[PDB]
Amino acid sequence: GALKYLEELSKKKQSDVVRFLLRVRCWEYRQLNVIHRASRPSRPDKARRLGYKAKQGYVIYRVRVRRGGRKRPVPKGATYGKPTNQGVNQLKYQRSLRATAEERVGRRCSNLRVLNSYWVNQDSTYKYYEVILVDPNHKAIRRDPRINWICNPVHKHRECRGLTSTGKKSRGLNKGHRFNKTRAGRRKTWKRHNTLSLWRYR
Template sequence: MLFLLRLRTWEFRQQRVIVRVPRPTRPEKARRVGFKSKQGFVIYRVRVRRGCRKKQVPKGATYGKPKNHGVNQLKHKRNLQAIAETRIGKRVAKALRVLGSYWVGQDSTFKFYEVICIDPHHKAIRRDPKVNWICDPVHKHRECRGLTSAGKKHRGLRGRGHGFAKTIGGSKSASWKRRNTLQLHRKR
């Protein structure tokens, strides 16, 4: 299995950043996300660079105080899977809606995801009562608003029940400690 994954990632690296694929690489995972092998469903594979995001600084001018001069080690608020979905959503915005995505491979530099898109104007989709909710205009650009599964994860909406909001940041004790620790920075 490891050899197969290594071979796949090598193959994915040779291709373009966004590639349309004829069938899912992981059919069982695709079906759990909501894929059906019928007309109107489209799958794209997308490559996302791992690690931190760089701040865009024209000519290296960051301006402001030294505290805000960082360029390289800035941690992105969204996870890489949500970023992959957004990039696909911008690419196919006119015709398709993003349903969800799943991981298919990674190496030291990139992560690869397959994103499931749906054509809301296709008759097969409009007639299917289990999927036709996505045809409603309110579901346009749901990936940009954090409404997919990956988007809800980075928004901290995965859990349920009383007190779940207090676990964001690792655990209840970690979030309590962060909220109750007074930090007096040298420059303030």
């Protein structure tokens, strides 16, 4: 197959051919809309390994998001409480720009379910992602057992609840001692550790 060659070529992002393609594609995507439908994945190997199939009901949407940190919406950019010794310019959003992109694409297409998303390009101002979406109401989707789990109502807006890949990465859902506080849910673990259990025959 050709996708092995595409994977090994996509690993080399500083080669002349890949840099040229990224430059011209960044120009095209910057003169397109912020959120717009892609007719086909521009990285077919990445889309295929993330779950895209050339079947009716699979949609690709391209999106650009402004990169960098976040700012608190306070008047005049200043807080009127205790001194925090830091400015609002250096506050970091706890989710990824990829997750923000998936949320905006889902709000644009509220009738689809977000499956996954992948990085395609970036510049100084924006980061560019392509988001795979699946139509739960399409008969080709509903008849296929490999994908019809997404038609169930428990998978409504996975990108809004952190059930996509970037959501799992931001929630820290990994096994081991490095993820003691977050592997089963951070707030659930906190409530479990802070509950006071009193038994009858204590």
